Enzyme design. Structure first.
Site, mmCIF file in Angstrom:
data_model
loop_
_atom_site.group_PDB
_atom_site.id
_atom_site.type_symbol
_atom_site.label_atom_id
_atom_site.label_comp_id
_atom_site.label_asym_id
_atom_site.label_seq_id
_atom_site.Cartn_x
_atom_site.Cartn_y
_atom_site.Cartn_z
ATOM 1 N N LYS C 147 0.945 -1.177 -0.308
ATOM 2 C CA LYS C 147 0.098 0.167 -0.098
ATOM 3 C C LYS C 147 0.621 1.169 0.090
ATOM 4 O O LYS C 147 1.496 1.457 1.186
ATOM 5 C CB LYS C 147 -0.780 0.262 0.980
ATOM 6 C CG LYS C 147 -1.502 -1.084 1.577
ATOM 7 C CD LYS C 147 -2.884 -0.906 2.495
ATOM 8 C CE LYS C 147 -3.979 0.169 1.856
ATOM 9 N NZ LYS C 147 -5.561 0.097 3.252
HETATM 10 C C1 LIG Z 1 -5.379 -1.238 -3.861
HETATM 11 C C2 LIG Z 1 -6.533 -2.209 -2.864
HETATM 12 N N1 LIG Z 1 -7.242 -3.510 -2.958
HETATM 13 C C3 LIG Z 1 -7.819 -4.327 -1.893
HETATM 14 C C4 LIG Z 1 -8.147 -3.523 -1.181
HETATM 15 C C5 LIG Z 1 -8.590 -4.153 0.104
HETATM 16 O O1 LIG Z 1 -7.794 -5.225 0.921
HETATM 17 P P1 LIG Z 1 -7.844 -5.292 2.187
HETATM 18 O O2 LIG Z 1 -9.435 -6.636 2.043
HETATM 19 O O3 LIG Z 1 -6.788 -6.234 3.216
HETATM 20 O O4 LIG Z 1 -8.583 -4.253 3.321
HETATM 21 C C6 LIG Z 1 -7.248 -2.417 -0.958
HETATM 22 C C7 LIG Z 1 -7.917 -1.708 0.402
HETATM 23 N N2 LIG Z 1 -9.117 -0.829 0.320
HETATM 24 C C8 LIG Z 1 -7.008 -1.610 -1.709
HETATM 25 O O5 LIG Z 1 -6.085 -0.734 -0.791
#
Ligand SMILES: Cc1ncc(COP(=O)(O)O)c(CN)c1O
Ligand SMILES: Cc1ncc(COP(=O)(O)O)c(CN)c1O
Ligand SMILES: Cc1ncc(COP(=O)(O)O)c(CN)c1O
Ligand SMILES: Cc1ncc(COP(=O)(O)O)c(CN)c1O
Ligand SMILES: Cc1ncc(COP(=O)(O)O)c(CN)c1O
Ligand SMILES: Cc1ncc(COP(=O)(O)O)c(CN)c1O
Lengths: 305, 301, 294, 297, 300, 297
Positions: C147
Site C-alpha cells: 500500500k
Molecule cells: C488496492 C487495494 N486492493 C484491495 C484492498 C482490500 O484489502 P483489505 O481487505 O486488506 O483491506 C485495498 C484496501 N482498501 C486496496 O487498497
C-alpha cells in the site's frame, strides 16, 4: 559438406579439416557466439567485398552486446576477410566471420571464457543468371514464432542464440510450403523475415519498416539510399500484416537475399501476384552497384586484388 | 580448463583432446543444440546418478522441439552416461550430454543437417558437501515468451538470455539473477526454479515460461512427504520480498536458500529452517541415505 | 474536514492541528509513503480491532518494498493503534497508520531521507461497477502487493472515472485484459454454487478477501481461486467485492449489465452477514481475529 | 535539511518552518500532487529563469490530468516563482512549484478535496560521462500512470529505479517500457548519436522534456540531422554517443550502460557541443535564444 | 447447400426458403449476433439433445455481453429446439440457434436495434480418430479478454477463428491451435485443449477461451474414471512433449491430437487416455451411462 | 426502419423488401463480411461521390484479407454505386456496399462459401464539440483482427466501445491499443493540435482513414505543419485541440475527453477551419480537389 577450403583460425589459415573446436566450447552449449554474413562479387576489376567495414563494425558491435572480447583489431579481421577470398581463389562468394566463447569453462556466465576464439571462412556463391524465380516472386507465410522483444534477446546483434528463433520460423515456413517466414513482434506488428528486412510499396511510395526488434540491415540501408537516389520517396513506418496484404509490392532485403520481390503472403497475392517493377528495378541497380558498375557506389566496394 | 577426460563421441569414447567439431557446425553459429545437466553423487554403494531417466527423457524432448534427430536410442545414451562416470573413475560429478547440429550446411534451417551429432562429457563436481543465503537481484532481461524461445527445452540458444542475466547479476554484486517474464511476474533464476514460503505454506512457482525443473519436482515431493502444504502459484517480486523464506532449486544449485533480493532482506535475512530442512533431506536422498527415494537413483557400479 | 482528534505522531499523541509535516516532504512530491486501513467494531465487550496483526505486518512489508525504515517496533505501532482508539473515545472507527519519507532532501532516491516519519490517526465510522480505462499496474511497474502512496494515483484515476460515469466503483483490468481488482477492493464471483476468488495477480493480498474465503469454506461452500475475464463476471450468478472499508459488498451490475437477478444475491449477502457477525465478536470460531481495546 | 528559506504558500511567503501541511493531506497518502522543476541561472543581467512559460504551462497541464483545480492564475504563479528567487536573494537556484490535494477527506477520489493547495520553494544550486544501468522496473504504460505529467505518484516508479541503479554502482537508471524498448532515465530523456545523426527517443511513455526540446532546437541550429525514433538497449550499446537531458541534468553525456562502454568510453563530441551551447543559452550568452529567458531583475 | 428443412423463425416454423433476413441487418455488417452449437444423438429411447440447458443458458449469456435482448423466454427456445428436431424427423443432428441484430438502423451501436431476431435451424449429422488430428499453431492470436468477448459465442469473434482455420487448412493441417497474445496456448479455432503427462490430465485454464461444455463434460468423466485433473496454463512445447493431447467440442466430441507443428505427440497416434474419455463420452451422449442421464433431453 | 429504396443485389436492383439473404449465411453467424462507407454531397453540378475509387479499392482490399472473392470487377461496383444514387434520386446520401459469405455451408472456414454475395444500398443523409471517453475495450492487436480492413466481425469491438461511451454520457469512444496508447474512435481517426502543429496519429492498429488522408492533404495545402506520431491519452488532454475524422464524422472537433476540457473547452480554430475547407472540397468549391469527386450526373 561445406566446401570452405582454407579457413582463418585465430591468426592463421589452416586446412578446413583442422578448423575444429572443443565440444566443450561455451558457444556450442549456450549460443554465445557472434557472426557476420558478407558477400564478394566478381567485377571487371576482380572480386569486390560489399560494405566490408560496415559488416566488421557490426561484428564488433555484436560482441560488445555479449561483453565478448575479440582479441584482434578490426584491421586484422578485415585483412583476414580479404585473404580468405584471395587464398581460396574465390570470385563470387559468401564470407562467414565467427567469434565464439571457448571451452575454458561451462558456467552460463561467459566472461570467464574471454577472449573469444575467432575464425573466418568463405565458400563459393552461385551467380544467378536466370529470371523466372525472381519475377515469380517469393511466397511468405506469417510465423507462429514471434521475433524476440528487445529485452529478451539482442535483436540488433547477430548473436548465435538469436537464430534459434529464426530457425524455428524458417522450418515452419518451409513445412507450410513457403519460401520464407515473416515474423511478427510480440505486439502483433510485422518485424522481419527469418533473415531479411522488409519493405512494401503503396501508391508510388516505398515504405521501409522501422528497426523495432529487427537487425539493422546493411542491405536495407543500401536499398534505401539507392531508392532515394533514383528519385523515390522513402518513408520509414511500423506495419501490420494487412498493410502488406494490400501493398502494391512487397520485397525483402538481406546480404544473401539481395533484393527479393515477394509476390504472396499467407496465400494472398501481393498486387499483380508477381514481382513488381519497383522491386525489380531496385534489385537491378543494387546488383549493378555490388558488381562495380555504378561509380556513385564504388565507395561501398573493397577490391581484393 | 575443464578436466573431462574420456568423452563419449557419437558412439565411442575418445580422449578429451579429440572431442572436437567443425567450426562450421550449425550449432556454433545458430544455437541449434540441446543439452542436459545431470549429477552423480558418491554414496555408500558408489556413485549414483540422480533421476537419469527423467533427464534423458527431457533431452529427447528438447530435441523434438527443434525437430532434431538423435541417432541413438535413449537406452544407448543412458548406457553412455553410466560409462562416462565409470571410465573416468568419477565419484561425485556433473554430466553434460549434448546434441548439436553439425557442419553439413549453414542455412538457418537445421533440417538438412540431421541427424544431430551427440556427445557425453563429465567432470568432477561437488567434491565437498549456505546458511548466509544467496543474494539475488531482479534482471533487466526478461525470460522469453513461450512463442519466442522454447522455454521448456534446454536449447543452446535459450541460454544467451540466461548468460546476459547472470552477467548482469554478478556485475551488480549478486550471486544470481531473478528474471521476470515480459508481463512483469517472477519467472526463474538464470538456471534455477524459484519457491517461497509464507505462513507455513510452501509456494512453488507455476511453470509459466520456465524450465520444468527436475529438482523442483523432487523438492515438491520431499516437501509433501514431510507434511508441508505445497501450493503452485504465479508470483510477483514483492510477494517474494515479503515471504518468510525464498529458495532456488536446480541440478547444480541443489536447494539454495535466498536471504536477500534487490538488497531487501527475506525474512530473517539468512537461510530459513524450511529451505534448510528441504535441502538436507534432498542431499540425503541424492547420496543414497533415504530408502524411500532410492527409486530416483541409478548406481553405476 | 476530518474529525480525527488526537493523532499519534512519531511516538506521542498531539492535537490534530499540530499533526503537520513540511511541504518539502519527499512523500508529498514523490508518493513515497505507505499506509494501512484498519477497522474497529463495537462488540458486547467494547471496541475490537479486526486482524490488527496482519495489518501491521503488511504495513512493515510495504515499507520494505520502498526500502523505507520504520523507526518503531511493530509492538509499539500496535500499542499506538489501540491508543488512538481509546484516547479518542472511539468505538466503531477507521484507523489510518501512515509512514512517509520526510524533508531531509528532494532527490528522487528516498534512501537519504530515512528513517521515515510515522503517524496513526483514526475517525468515527448492490454496487454498480464500470470497467476502467486505466489498467492496474504490472508487477514490475508499481508494487501492487504494497500500500504505497504513489500506487493510488492509479486507483484515484479509476475511481473518478467510475463515479463520473454514474457508477459506485471502478473495476480495473490488468494490462493483459484480465480482471484485476476494484480501485480499493478485491473481487469474487459465484457460479453454479461455487465461489470464485480471483488470484492475486497484480492486486493487493486483501485481508478481507482472506477472511471471506475462510468464512466461505467454514460455511460449506466450495471455493476456487482463478484468473477471470470481464465476461466471466457478466455471466456469473453473483459478483461481490471485499475490503476493509467495503466489508463484503454485493455487485448487482457491471458495465450496465445486470449480474444474475440484477440485485444482491444470497451468497454475497450471507457472507457479508457472517463477516459482520465475526468482526463484532458473535462467532467464537473467529475470536482470534479480534483485538479488544478495553 | 533543505535550505529553502522563504516559501510561497497559497498566496503569501512564509518562513520555511511555517510551510507545513496536515499529515491527513490526500497527497501524502495517495500521491495526488503535481510539481515542476525549474532552474534560474546567473547572467550578465542578473538571474534568469529558463523557459518559465513552458514549465508553468506543464504544471497546469499535469493538474488537468488529475482533474486538480489550481486556485491561482498562471500569471500569479509566474510572479510567485520570480519572487521566490528575489525574496531569497538567489542567483543560481532550483525552483520547485507544488500543488497537492489537501486534508478535506481521505476517500481515494480526490475531487472532493479541490481546490488544491499550492506552494513554491527554491534553493541554491562531465567528460568522464555518466554510467547507467538498465532497470528491472519498467516505465509505466500510458494507461497505467500519466507519464506526460509530473504527478507525485509517478515517481515511486522513478524512485525504485534510481535506488536500484545506485545500489548497483551506477549514476542513473535507464528504464525500458513494458514491451522492452528504451523509455527514459528516472528523471531524464534520452538521445543517442550514430554516424553523425542525432537520435532523440520518441515521447512514448516518457515526459515531454523541455530540455529535450531545447537540445533538439540547438542541434538543428548547429546543422545536425535529428531523427525521432524508438530505440532498443542494444542500439544504445552500439551508438557512437548517448546522452541525457533534464532540467537538473542539463545535457549529461553517458559513457557506459550496463558496464558496456559507449563509443570511446568517455563523453563524446556531439554531446559536449550541445551541452556547451545549452549552457551558453541559459546564461544569456546566445542572443538567438534570449526568448527562452525570463530575467528576474 | 445446407439441408435444414423447417426453420424456427421468431416463434414459428417456416420452410428453409422463407428463412431470410434483410441485407441491412446490423449483424450482417457488424458481427452482432450470438449463436450456439448443440447436438442430438440417437439412443434406444429416441433422439436425445446433449446438455440443452447449459447451451441455452450460454446462448442468453452471450446475448447479455452484447446487451442484446432475446424476446423469448429460455423455456420457449428450449421447446423450439426440441421441435426443430421433431418436425424435421431428425435423429442424429446438429442444432444451430441464432439471435441477431436486425435492420432497424445501421449505426454501429446495436442498442437501437433491440430486440434481436431469433431463429433455430438443424441438419442431419475409427481409423481417422485412431490416427489422430494434426494441428498447426496459428499466426493469429486469440483475442485478449478486453478486445473481444471470448466467453461468448458472438458472431464477430469468429473472424479470428475463420482466419486461423483457413491458415491451418492451407498449411495441410486438420485444425489450428491459437496462442494468446502473450504466447501461451489458448484453444483451437473451435475447440478446447487438454494434454496428458505421466498419467495426469491437464485441462487448459479458461484464459481467453470459451468455457466449453464438452470440456466440462470430459473433466467430470475423467474424475469419475479416477484420473487426476489439473487446470493449468500451457505452452506449445509443453504440448510437444506431452504423452497425449486432445481437443473437445460439440462437433469435435473428444478428438485425439497426434501431431502439432509436424512434431509427433507421444507415440504419434491417438493415446489411451483420450480414447477412454471419448468412449465414455460417446456412451454418455447415446444414453448408455445411467449416471449421466441428467445431461440428456429426450425429444420423444 | 431504413429508407434505402432500390438496392443493387448481385448485379441487379430490387425493391428493399426483396433485398434479403438466408439466415444460414456464413456472415450472419461468423462476421465474415466486408463493407464500405461512402458519401455523396450535393454540389452546384448535382450529386458528387467523394473519393469513390479509394473506397472501392479498400473494399476489394478488405475482401482479400478474408480471402473472399468478389464476383464483380471494381468498375462494375463503381457503376452500381453511381446508379444507387441515380435510381433513388438521392442528392446528399450515405452509400453502403457490402460483400458477405453466403449460406453454402456453416463450417467456420469461409473458403467453401466463395464467391461472396454483394449488394449496394444507400439512404438520405460541432461548434460545442464532441465529448469522448476512453474505452475499457482495447482496439484489436494487428494479429488478432485485421484492423486495416472493414471486416464485419471487427465491429463487435467498435460496437462494445460505442455503447460504453454513450452509456457513460459521451458522444463517442476513444479506444486505446493493448499497450495503452491512443488508437482511434469507434469509427473515426484521431488528430490533435499543439503549439500550431497538427498531429495525425500513426496508423498502428487503426483503419487507414480516407478522411484522415484528405484532412492531412488539406492541412498541408493550407500551410499547416503536419506530423504523424504515436500518442497517449494525456498528450490529448494537454493538446490545444483534438478532432476526429471519418466519412460520417467529416471533421469533428473534440471539446472534452474523460471530462477534461481540451484547450478552451469548445471547438478550436484549426479543427473548425479544416472542417469548413473539407466541406468546401466535398461540395466542389475547391478546384484543387476536383479529382476527388465523381459526379453522378
Ligand atoms: C488496492 C487495494 N486492493 C484491495 C484492498 C482490500 O484489502 P483489505 O481487505 O486488506 O483491506 C485495498 C484496501 N482498501 C486496496 O487498497
Ligand atoms: C535476423 C536478420 N535480419 C536481417 C538480415 C539482413 O541484414 P543484412 O542486410 O545486413 O545482411 C539478416 C542477415 N541475413 C538477419 O540475420
Ligand atoms: C533455465 C533453467 N531453469 C531451471 C533449471 C533447473 O532445472 P533442473 O532442476 O532440472 O536442473 C535449469 C538447469 N540448471 C535451467 O537451465
Ligand atoms: C520523468 C522525467 N523525465 C524527464 C525529465 C526531464 O524533463 P525536463 O527537461 O522538462 O526537466 C524529468 C525532470 N527531471 C522527469 O521527471
Ligand atoms: C471458440 C470455441 N471454443 C471452444 C468451443 C467448444 O465448446 P463446446 O464444448 O461448448 O462446444 C467452441 C464450440 N465449437 C468454440 O466455438
Ligand atoms: C474503425 C474505423 N476507423 C476509422 C474510420 C474512418 O475512415 P474513413 O475516413 O475512410 O471513413 C472508420 C469509418 N467510419 C472506421 O470504421
Amino acid at each position: 559438406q561445406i566446401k570452405a577450403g582454407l579457413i582463418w583460425m585465430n591468426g592463421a589459415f589452416v586446412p578446413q579439416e583442422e578448423a575444429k573446436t572443443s565440444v566443450l566450447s561455451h558457444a556450442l552449449h549456450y549460443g554465445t557466439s557472434v557472426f557476420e554474413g558478407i558477400r564478394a562479387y566478381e567485377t571487371a576489376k576482380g572480386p569486390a567485398i560489399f560494405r566490408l567495414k560496415e559488416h566488421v563494425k557490426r561484428f564488433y558491435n555484436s560482441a560488445k552486446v555479449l561483453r565478448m572480447e575479440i582479441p584482434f583489431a578490426p584491421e586484422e579481421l578485415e585483412e583476414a576477410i580479404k585473404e580468405v577470398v584471395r587464398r581460396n581463389g574465390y570470385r563470387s562468394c559468401y564470407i562467414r566471420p565467427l567469434a565464439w566463447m571457448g571451452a575454458k569453462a561451462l558456467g552460463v556466465n561467459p566472461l570467464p571464457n574471454n577472449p573469444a576464439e575467432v575464425m573466418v571462412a568463405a565458400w563459393e556463391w552461385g551467380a544467378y543468371l536466370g529470371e523466372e524465380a525472381v519475377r515469380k516472386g517469393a511466397r511468405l507465410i506469417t510465423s507462429s514464432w514471434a521475433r524476440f522483444p528487445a529485452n529478451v534477446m539482442p535483436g540488433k546483434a547477430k548473436v548465435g542464440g538469436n537464430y534459434v528463433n529464426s530457425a524455428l520460423a524458417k522450418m515452419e515456413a518451409v513445412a507450410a510450403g513457403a519460401d520464407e517466414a515473416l515474423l511478427l513482434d510480440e505486439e502483433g506488428y510485422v518485424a522481419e523475415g527469418s533473415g531479411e528486412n522488409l519493405f512494401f510499396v503503396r501508391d508510388g511510395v516505398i515504405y521501409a519498416l522501422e528497426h523495432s526488434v529487427n537487425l539493422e540491415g546493411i542491405t536495407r540501408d543500401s536499398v534505401i539510399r539507392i531508392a532515394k537516389d533514383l528519385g523515390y520517396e522513402v518513408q520509414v513506418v511500423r506495419a501490420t500484416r494487412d498493410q502488406l496484404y494490400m501493398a502494391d509490392e512487397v520485397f525483402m532485403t538481406g546480404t544473401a537475399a539481395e533484393v527479393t520481390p515477394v509476390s504472396m503472403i499467407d496465400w494472398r497475392p501481393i498486387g499483380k501476384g508477381t514481382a513488381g517493377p519497383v522491386a525489380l528495378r531496385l534489385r537491378e541497380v543494387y546488383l549493378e552497384a555490388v558488381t562495380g558498375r555504378r561509380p556513385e557506389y564504388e565507395g561501398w566496394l573493397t577490391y581484393v586484388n
